[PDB]
Amino acid sequence: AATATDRLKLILAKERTLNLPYMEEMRKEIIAVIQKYTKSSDIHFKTLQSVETIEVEIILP
Amino acid sequence: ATDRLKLILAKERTLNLPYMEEMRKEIIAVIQKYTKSSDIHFKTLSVETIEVEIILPR
């Protein structure tokens, strides 16, 4: 319903064309930081215009 | 013209998160650690969203 379970959402957008070989490493660390301050353990992260959005859904404790 | 990056951290504005703004700080740090970007813009806008637009330097 419109009440139980607190979520947090993180989006990382970039040029689909762009290189950046560390995106992964960055993803991992970014998530690591969130878990640190939110103590969350339920984390969902998927990838997909021509913009690419690493989407990350985080359920708070 | 310029290669940008953008990040959104969204939450329900009601919800009380003492640590927001710390996460923001830290998270930016990580991004800088990896992008080395000297240019960063963050603003806060039912749903509170923290947006960080980042300009890559390389």
Author numbering:
A (entry chain A): 13 to 60, 64 to 76
B (entry chain B): 16 to 60, 65 to 77
Q: What's the paper's own text on this?
A:
The crystal structure of full-length HpMinE was solved using the multi-wavelength anomalous dispersion (MAD) method and refined to an Rwork = 26.2% and Rfree = 29.6% at 2.8 Å resolution. Two monomers were observed in an asymmetric unit; they formed a homodimeric α/β structure with an upper surface (the α-face) consisting of α-helix and a lower surface (the β-face) consisting of an anti-parallel twisted β-sheet. The extensive hydrophobic dimer interface subsumed about 1100 Å2 of surface area (22.8% of the total surface area), and size exclusion chromatography showed that HpMinE forms a stable dimer in solution (data not shown). Each monomer is composed of a long helix αA (residues 35–50) and a three-stranded anti-parallel β-sheet comprised of βA (residues 19–26), βB (residues 54–59) and βC (residues 67–74). The N-terminus of HpMinE (residues 1–12 in MolA; residues 1–15 in MolB) was disordered and invisible within the crystal structure. Within the crystal packing, HpMinE forms the spiral structure with 12 protomers per turn generated by the sixfold symmetry. The formation of the polymeric structure is entirely attributable to the dimer–dimer interaction mediated by the anti-parallel βB-strand. To further analyse the dimer–dimer interaction observed in the crystal structure of native HpMinE, we compared the crystal structures of HpMinE crystallized in two different space groups. Native and Se-Met-labelled crystals of HpMinE were crystallized in the P64 and P65 space groups respectively. The conformation of the dimer was well conserved in the two crystal forms, but the dimer–dimer interaction began to deviate in the tetramer formation, and the packing was tilted about 24° in hexamers.
